[PDB]
Amino acid sequence: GSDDGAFGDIWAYMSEALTGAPGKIIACGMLFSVAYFGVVKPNLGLALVSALMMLVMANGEKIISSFLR
Amino acid sequence: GSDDGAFGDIWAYMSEALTGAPGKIIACGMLFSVAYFGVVKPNLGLALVSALMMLVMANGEKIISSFLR
Amino acid sequence: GSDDGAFGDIWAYMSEALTGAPGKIIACGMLFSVAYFGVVKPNLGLALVSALMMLVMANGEKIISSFLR
Amino acid sequence: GSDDGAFGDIWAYMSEALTGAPGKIIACGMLFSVAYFGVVKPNLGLALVSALMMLVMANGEKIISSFLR
Amino acid sequence: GSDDGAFGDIWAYMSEALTGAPGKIIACGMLFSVAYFGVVKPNLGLALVSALMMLVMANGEKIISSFLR
Amino acid sequence: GSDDGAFGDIWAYMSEALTGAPGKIIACGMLFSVAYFGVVKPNLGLALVSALMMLVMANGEKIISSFLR
Amino acid sequence: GSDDGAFGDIWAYMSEALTGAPGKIIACGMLFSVAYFGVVKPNLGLALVSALMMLVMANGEKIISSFLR
Amino acid sequence: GSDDGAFGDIWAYMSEALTGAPGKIIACGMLFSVAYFGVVKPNLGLALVSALMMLVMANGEKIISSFLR
Amino acid sequence: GSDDGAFGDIWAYMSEALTGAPGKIIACGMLFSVAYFGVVKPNLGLALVSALMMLVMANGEKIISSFLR
Amino acid sequence: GSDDGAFGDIWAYMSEALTGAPGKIIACGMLFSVAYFGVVKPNLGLALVSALMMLVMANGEKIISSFLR
Amino acid sequence: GSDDGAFGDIWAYMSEALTGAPGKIIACGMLFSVAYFGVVKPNLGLALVSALMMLVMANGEKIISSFLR
Amino acid sequence: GSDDGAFGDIWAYMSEALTGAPGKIIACGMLFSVAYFGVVKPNLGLALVSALMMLVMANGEKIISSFLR
Amino acid sequence: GSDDGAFGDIWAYMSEALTGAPGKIIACGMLFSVAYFGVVKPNLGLALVSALMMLVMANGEKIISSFLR
Amino acid sequence: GSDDGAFGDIWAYMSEALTGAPGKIIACGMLFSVAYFGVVKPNLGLALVSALMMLVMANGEKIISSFLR
Amino acid sequence: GSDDGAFGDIWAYMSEALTGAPGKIIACGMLFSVAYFGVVKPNLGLALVSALMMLVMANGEKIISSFLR
Amino acid sequence: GSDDGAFGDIWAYMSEALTGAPGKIIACGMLFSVAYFGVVKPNLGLALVSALMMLVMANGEKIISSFLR
Amino acid sequence: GSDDGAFGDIWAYMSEALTGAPGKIIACGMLFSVAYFGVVKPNLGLALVSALMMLVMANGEKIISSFLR
Amino acid sequence: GSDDGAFGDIWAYMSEALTGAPGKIIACGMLFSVAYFGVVKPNLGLALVSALMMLVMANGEKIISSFLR
Amino acid sequence: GSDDGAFGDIWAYMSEALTGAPGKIIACGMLFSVAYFGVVKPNLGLALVSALMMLVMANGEKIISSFLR
Amino acid sequence: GSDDGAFGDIWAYMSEALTGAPGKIIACGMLFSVAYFGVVKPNLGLALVSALMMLVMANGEKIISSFLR
Numbered sequence A, B, C, D, E, F, G, H, I, J, K, L, M, N, O, P, Q, R, S, T: 001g002s003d004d005g006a007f008g009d010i011w012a013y014m015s016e017a018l019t020g021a022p023g024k025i026i027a028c029g030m031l032f033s034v035a036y037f038g039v040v041k042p043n044l045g046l047a048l049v050s051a052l053m054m055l056v057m058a059n060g061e062k063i064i065s066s067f068l069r
């Protein structure tokens, strides 16, 4: 596909925000949720799942660009 | 069918936008939704479903052209 | 029935447009709707229903000609 | 009743047009409406209702001739 | 990614709060839960798991910044 | 009741279509739905229910003719 | 009441059509609807309700004649 | 009141037609409507309401004669 | 029943697609789901259930043709 | 069945991804889960079950192609 | 209250029908529903609730006459 | 207020009919509705609500006379 | 109550069908469900509950006739 | 009860299928489940329970016919 | 019972697979489990139980055919 | 058709105004409406529909010229 | 298209107001609605949707100018 | 954008009220809701979500001004 | 923010009521719920969670004033 | 906080009822539950936990007043 056009700016902003401030806020939210739910039931596996989700987010733009040319 | 006519330009724009900027924006929206809903309930299967939906979107024009000659 | 007459040209245009540019535009609209509604609730079954509707559209002229001789 | 008279030609034209070009145009309109309304809410039952209406149209002249002798 | 933008202040507040007062409150909650559940079943391994979770929290901002550029 | 009359052709077409192409299409739709919903939750009991519904469809004309003389 | 009069023929036609071709067409419509809605949600209870409605239709003329003398 | 007079014949005809052929035609219409609307939404309660309306019609002349002496 | 008619092409396409590309895609989806859910809870019985569902899909057209003549 | 058609590309991508990068990611996830759950309860049998699941995944395309012709 | 008047016949018919044929039909409907819903989830408590509802129906006329003098 | 006047007879008839034949017919209608809706969802609480409504109807004339002197 | 009237035929048909073909079909459905759910969790107590439900169905007409005179 | 009627064919098919191909498939499913669950926990008592369930299935039609006359 | 019908192919495949490749895979799984659990607690009696389970599997089709005629 | 004549100037002005200032004003009105209605119910699909309507407006002159020669 | 003409001032005012005071008022309205609806059901995803709508509004003039030349 | 104009005062009032008395009232409402819903189900995570929503509200004016220039 | 204005009195009342009579009533409700749910399952940890929620309520006004200036 | 106001009476009643009749009823319920569950599994530790919960209830008003000024 083409990254330009009438919606090029919106797509660019979303792609940079995926690894930018909103993405970091969401990742910090996952970290806070993992810490909070670990008070009663300590489970560090959810931390690993959160790290994997962060890795997926870091590669989200590449995946989208590969699937949608 | 025929890709030309009075509505040829609209169809062409929609077909290129399916894998273009609007399609990439929608895919980034799916990625953001997967990241956001994973804060409380971490579920990486929805990421796989989103990848499959992106693959379907990448093949949408081919499917439409095959069904509608 | 008879495909000719005073309204033969209108019927011919509609029959070719069912699988032509307007039909492809409508199918692309279904694909866009399926992609958009899958952001919050991923559901690939609606994609299958859309494919079935496209198959029905591809056979619409045959069905109409068979029912209305 | 009698199919002839001063209005025999009008009745003949209407009876042939029920399954002719105007009837096929109306059936194609139903198909287009079913396809269009299926973009947001996919519902293939309306296609079945449209097929039943087409079947009724194909038998309209017989029904009219049976009721009105 | 970029730490600035419209959501830079929110991200900064969350990053400092991860190791700040809310994070310390959550860690104290884990300590209280470990002490309380140890009344009937004494288990100091959960204290070690809580310490590991605190160590993860102390490194949460670094992990998020490394994954999300 | 009587199978003939002004609506005899419509009733005949519907009765043959119950076990004909439309009925087979609906049964294939049930099979596709059973296969699709079995991806996340494998449940072969719905296949048995679909087979029972197909058996009911195969006997639909007999049931209608018995109830409505 | 009296089954004869100026409207005796209309009443006779309606009474025979209740269990005749129109009634059978309506019952086949219920069967088709039950089959179609069972694709996504298999529910054979609606088939039982349809059978009960067919039984009511088969006794409709008797009920009307008993209530209206 | 008095059932005779200049309008005695009209009143007599209407009173006998309430439970006669027109009333039976209207009741058959209610039965047909109940059967038709039950194709998509099966609801046998409307059949009970129709039976109650038929019972009211059977007692309409008595009610009118009691209210209007 | 009859495999031909106005809906013969749709039925043929659905029957071949049951064991064709869409059916294989659905089966691959079941395999992916079995692999994904086996990360946390390894359960190879769901693989056997998926194989049985694939066997049912391979025999779906035969079952439909046997039930609906 | 046929591997080609409108959905041939999607099926091909899924079949190669079963043993490709997504399949390897899922297998690495199983390995990570086995390692993590072995910290408190060492169980190398789950490693054998994971190896068997990997073997099943390596043969998934063959199984699907054999069941669905 | 008074059981007679212009609506005495309607009230009498309804009171006898509560324990008459319509009431027995409704009770048989409850029995059929209890049997049908017990196929997947066997629950004989709903049978007890249905028996209690039948007991209430048998005493409905007495309750109405006691409340409404 | 005054119970007499030009509208004294109408008010008297309505007050006696509230607990008379029309009121009993309405109460029997509530009982029939409770029985009918209990076929699919058994709920005896609606019977209690119906009994309370009957009690309100039995006291309707007293309430009206107390509010409107 | 009275077994005759306008709804006597419907009540008779339902009473005979409770122990007739529909009742036997429902009982066979319970047997099939018990067999199917016993594949993963063998539980012969549900067979006893199904037998008790069949016994209740065999006595349903007697219970209805006793409660509703 | 009576084995004939509008639903006689459905009941006959279900009764023969209880000990026919579907019943044998379900029994083979129980055998496969017993074999699979015996890999980790060898328990041949579940095989005896499965044999008893097969014996119950072989006598299901007799039980249904005895309970429902 | 009858081994043929709409489900004859599925039953045949399951019966041959009981002693075929899936059955041999399950038996090899039992052997692997016996070997693995014998590392810490050597117990050759579980090998005898596994051999008995294999013997039961080899006779599963005969048992099913004898119980279900 | 011919773009010239007595009404050539009016047609030219309307055609340029479709994509000119009035068309842009109408499109801005759609954007304002989408923003305003999104305050209570956020729905970005209406933005996509508005973009499609803008695309239709951009091609309106071509469509009119193609249909009306 | 042309931004000038008789309606150039209106279009200019609307374009500047989209990102001006009215647009900021509408965005503040979305923020207030998100805060208010979060009192009973806390949902920060609606905040993300509101941010995306604000981003769309910021690019509305560019989209309109690109679609309408 | 421009903060001045005819709607500058309204925008200024809304921006100051977001962090002013109405915003504080809404935040106190969230605190009251969190306290009230914690009576039956104690959940302090909703307090964290409320704090995050308050942080978003404190940065709402900055976000709006950044998105809408 | 500013604590004064048109809504200053409402905000003041809510802030004092958070630690006033309504807040104490809610805290007593939490204590009553903890006591009541401890009858069957004694759990004093919920008392600690309730104390923490009370501490949060005591600091709610400070948190709101800090977040919303 | 302030113990007076519009809700002062409700708070006073709740505070006195915590150690009054409702609190004593709840404590007696805990004693009855401890006695009842001790029939099969004698456990006097639950009596100690109940005594501690009673001590907490006796100090509930003091705790609430200290936390909420």
Ligand SMILES: CCCCCCCCCCCCCCCC(=O)OC[C@H](COP(=O)(O)OC[C@@H](O)CO)OC(=O)CCCCCCCCCCCCCCC
Pocket (backbone or CB within 6 Å): A022, A025, A026, A028, A029, A030, A032, A033, A036, B036, B037, B039, B040, E010, E013, E014, E017, E022, Q042, Q043, Q044, Q045, Q047, Q048, Q050, Q051, R045, R046, R048, R049, R051, R052, R055, R056, R063
């Ligand atoms: C101020 C202190 C720093 C924040 C500390 C805590 C942050 C919260 C995360 C952990 C709480 C976990 C326990 C929750 C307890 C819980 O049950 O939560 C339920 C609540 C609702 O989430 P869902 O809608 O997924 O849940 C549906 C049901 O679960 C409803 O209960 O979850 C959230 O709202 C938290 C996720 C937000 C995380 C993403 C936030 C970032 C996106 C927005 C960024 C701002 C956009 C601004 C645009 C203007």
Ligand SMILES: CCCCCCCCCCCCCCCC(=O)OC[C@H](COP(=O)(O)OC[C@@H](O)CO)OC(=O)CCCCCCCCCCCCCCC
Pocket (backbone or CB within 6 Å): B010, B013, B014, B017, B022, C022, C025, C026, C028, C029, C030, C032, C033, C036, D036, D037, D039, D040, P045, P046, P048, P049, P051, P052, P055, P056, P063
């Ligand atoms: C420019 C970018 C490419 C377009 C991207 C998106 C296209 C829109 C489709 C997905 C949006 C889905 C979410 C919608 C959200 C939504 O609620 O939509 C509601 C809106 C109204 O649809 P209905 O009238 O079916 O809805 C009734 C109620 O639902 C009203 O809300 O749906 C549409 O207008 C979209 C369907 C148009 C699809 C067919 C268009 C092709 C036909 C016209 C071709 C041109 C004819 C020209 C003749 C001159």
Ligand SMILES: CCCCCCCCCCCCCCCC(=O)OC[C@H](COP(=O)(O)OC[C@@H](O)CO)OC(=O)CCCCCCCCCCCCCCC
Pocket (backbone or CB within 6 Å): A036, A037, A039, A040, E022, E025, E026, E028, E029, E030, E032, E033, E036, R042, R043, R044, R045, R047, R048, R050, R051, S045, S046, S048, S049, S051, S052, S055, S056, S063
């Ligand atoms: C006042 C005295 C000092 C506090 C002492 C005890 C503190 C509680 C911790 C130990 C209790 C353990 C036994 C619990 C017994 C138990 O079953 O708890 C269940 C309860 C609910 O937790 P989850 O939602 O994880 O549980 C789901 C199910 O388990 C429900 O039972 O757990 C908590 O609420 C405690 C965790 C809060 C810990 C994090 C608190 C800090 C985050 C909030 C900070 C304030 C944000 C303010 C924003 C305005």
Ligand SMILES: CCCCCCCCCCCCCCCC(=O)OC[C@H](COP(=O)(O)OC[C@@H](O)CO)OC(=O)CCCCCCCCCCCCCCC
Pocket (backbone or CB within 6 Å): D045, D046, D048, D049, D051, D052, D055, D056, D063, F010, F013, F014, F017, F022, G022, G025, G026, G028, G029, G030, G032, G033, G036, H036, H037, H039, H040
């Ligand atoms: C040609 C193939 C054979 C037909 C196959 C399917 C037949 C349709 C039945 C199943 C579709 C179910 C899903 C529908 C999806 C759906 O939403 O339907 C909605 C549509 C409208 O029904 P209502 O007006 O009850 O609905 C009001 C709203 O629901 C509108 O949506 O229902 C029908 O038209 C079907 C019922 C007709 C059945 C009675 C037909 C027989 C009466 C006429 C006989 C001819 C008289 C001729 C006189 C000249």
Ligand SMILES: CCCCCCCCCCCCCCCC(=O)OC[C@H](COP(=O)(O)OC[C@@H](O)CO)OC(=O)CCCCCCCCCCCCCCC
Pocket (backbone or CB within 6 Å): B045, B046, B048, B049, B051, B052, B055, B056, B063, C042, C043, C044, C045, C047, C048, C050, C051, F036, F037, F039, F040, I022, I025, I026, I028, I029, I030, I032, I033, I036, J010, J013, J014, J017, J022
């Ligand atoms: C690109 C990489 C290759 C794909 C890898 C993964 C594929 C996904 C399968 C495994 C995910 C399992 C965990 C899911 C996690 C999960 O919770 O999923 C939930 C989601 C929704 O499924 P249901 O509607 O059954 O679920 C209802 C609720 O469970 C909603 O959560 O499931 C799916 O969408 C996956 C099934 C699609 C499988 C069939 C797809 C093939 C049909 C469409 C073919 C295209 C038609 C095109 C027509 C134009």
Ligand SMILES: CCCCCCCCCCCCCCCC(=O)OC[C@H](COP(=O)(O)OC[C@@H](O)CO)OC(=O)CCCCCCCCCCCCCCC
Pocket (backbone or CB within 6 Å): A045, A046, A048, A049, A051, A052, A055, A056, A063, B042, B043, B044, B045, B047, B048, B050, B051, I036, I037, I039, I040, J022, J025, J026, J028, J029, J030, J032, J033, J036
């Ligand atoms: C960054 C470091 C490298 C990653 C290290 C760890 C990876 C996680 C695996 C081990 C954690 C085990 C303990 C978990 C603790 C746990 O309770 O997990 C629960 C969580 C939810 O899984 P389910 O939905 O199966 O669970 C349902 C309930 O168990 C919820 O608790 O499991 C996962 O999400 C992990 C499986 C993902 C494994 C497959 C990932 C690959 C598929 C996606 C590939 C990307 C697709 C991208 C498309 C855009």
Ligand SMILES: CCCCCCCCCCCCCCCC(=O)OC[C@H](COP(=O)(O)OC[C@@H](O)CO)OC(=O)CCCCCCCCCCCCCCC
Pocket (backbone or CB within 6 Å): H045, H046, H048, H049, H051, H052, H055, H056, H063, K010, K013, K014, K017, K022, L022, L025, L026, L028, L029, L030, L032, L033, L036
């Ligand atoms: C003949 C057999 C004995 C009757 C058996 C059943 C009686 C019906 C009650 C139960 C049906 C419940 C399920 C209904 C299914 C249903 O959806 O009903 C809908 C229908 C319309 O009621 P509404 O107008 O309240 O409903 C508005 C919407 O719900 C329309 O669907 O309800 C009725 O007509 C029943 C209430 C009549 C009850 C009061 C009747 C007594 C007043 C009239 C007395 C005669 C006056 C004569 C003056 C000349």
Ligand SMILES: CCCCCCCCCCCCCCCC(=O)OC[C@H](COP(=O)(O)OC[C@@H](O)CO)OC(=O)CCCCCCCCCCCCCCC
Pocket (backbone or CB within 6 Å): F045, F046, F048, F049, F051, F052, F055, F056, F063, G042, G043, G044, G045, G047, G048, G050, G051, K036, K037, K039, K040, M022, M025, M026, M028, M029, M030, M032, M033, M036, N010, N013, N014, N017, N022
């Ligand atoms: C063709 C082969 C012979 C049939 C073999 C299997 C028959 C099915 C029974 C066992 C399946 C159990 C596992 C199901 C898996 C399952 O989840 O089922 C769910 C499905 C829906 O049942 P409910 O509506 O009770 O369930 C609500 C939710 O559970 C939806 O999942 O259950 C049925 O449809 C089966 C009961 C029908 C049994 C009664 C049928 C006889 C009444 C109709 C007679 C015909 C009337 C014709 C009138 C025209």
Ligand SMILES: CCCCCCCCCCCCCCCC(=O)OC[C@H](COP(=O)(O)OC[C@@H](O)CO)OC(=O)CCCCCCCCCCCCCCC
Pocket (backbone or CB within 6 Å): F042, F043, F044, F045, F047, F048, F050, F051, I045, I046, I048, I049, I051, I052, I055, I056, I063, M036, M037, M039, M040, N022, N025, N026, N028, N029, N030, N032, N033, N036, O010, O013, O014, O017, O022
């Ligand atoms: C292709 C190779 C031959 C097949 C080998 C294995 C067959 C599967 C049996 C053993 C697996 C045991 C471990 C399962 C692991 C497991 O957890 O299974 C769970 C899954 C769901 O069963 P339920 O719904 O009873 O379970 C509810 C929860 O347990 C969900 O996990 O069980 C089945 O689907 C297997 C039973 C099917 C057996 C009956 C099949 C025959 C009926 C259908 C016949 C076709 C009808 C066609 C109509 C068109």
Ligand SMILES: CCCCCCCCCCCCCCCC(=O)OC[C@H](COP(=O)(O)OC[C@@H](O)CO)OC(=O)CCCCCCCCCCCCCCC
Pocket (backbone or CB within 6 Å): I042, I043, I044, I045, I047, I048, I050, I051, J045, J046, J048, J049, J051, J052, J055, J056, J063, N036, N037, N039, N040, O022, O025, O026, O028, O029, O030, O032, O033, O036
């Ligand atoms: C690649 C190397 C060769 C494989 C070596 C080891 C194979 C595993 C057997 C021994 C492990 C024993 C210790 C396990 C440790 C353990 O705790 O296992 C637990 C795990 C789960 O089994 P269950 O669901 O019976 O257990 C329930 C709980 O025990 C969960 O822990 O057992 C299995 O998955 C192994 C049985 C599979 C054996 C049957 C496999 C053949 C059927 C599938 C054939 C493929 C179908 C394909 C269809 C597409």
Ligand SMILES: CCCCCCCCCCCCCCCC(=O)OC[C@H](COP(=O)(O)OC[C@@H](O)CO)OC(=O)CCCCCCCCCCCCCCC
Pocket (backbone or CB within 6 Å): P036, P037, P039, P040, Q022, Q025, Q026, Q028, Q029, Q030, Q032, Q033, Q036, R010, R013, R014, R017, R022
């Ligand atoms: C003074 C304090 C600062 C204001 C605080 C709150 C502002 C309201 C926003 C949040 C309320 C959310 C809950 C509402 C509850 C609710 O149900 O609202 C319903 C109400 C009606 O909206 P719709 O017509 O979309 O709704 C149709 C149905 O939902 C009717 O209920 O929504 C609005 O009016 C709010 C949106 C206005 C937001 C845009 C305002 C800016 C445009 C006008 C600028 C002035 C133009 C002046 C020209 C002279």
Ligand SMILES: CCCCCCCCCCCCCCCC(=O)OC[C@H](COP(=O)(O)OC[C@@H](O)CO)OC(=O)CCCCCCCCCCCCCCC
Pocket (backbone or CB within 6 Å): R036, R037, R039, R040, S022, S025, S026, S028, S029, S030, S032, S033, S036, T010, T013, T014, T017, T022
């Ligand atoms: C008179 C004796 C003293 C009161 C003793 C008990 C007080 C109740 C608390 C413990 C019951 C726990 C077991 C409940 C069993 C239960 O299931 O409850 C369910 C019920 C509904 O609560 P939710 O809406 O959170 O629940 C949703 C679902 O759980 C519905 O079941 O909970 C409450 O209503 C209790 C919380 C009220 C506590 C706050 C009350 C103070 C706020 C109002 C102050 C007055 C405002 C006046 C303005 C005019």
Ligand SMILES: CCCCCCCCCCCCCCCC(=O)OC[C@H](COP(=O)(O)OC[C@@H](O)CO)OC(=O)CCCCCCCCCCCCCCC
Pocket (backbone or CB within 6 Å): S036, S037, S039, S040, T022, T025, T026, T028, T029, T030, T032, T033, T036
């Ligand atoms: C008449 C004889 C004297 C009473 C003897 C026994 C009293 C019951 C206590 C011991 C039973 C223990 C075994 C239960 C077996 C059991 O499973 O119980 C379950 C049942 C439900 O409790 P939960 O809702 O905590 O349980 C949720 C699930 O466990 C449901 O099973 O527990 C209670 O209802 C007992 C607690 C009431 C105790 C508090 C009562 C005082 C509050 C109400 C005061 C009146 C307010 C009036 C306002 C108008």
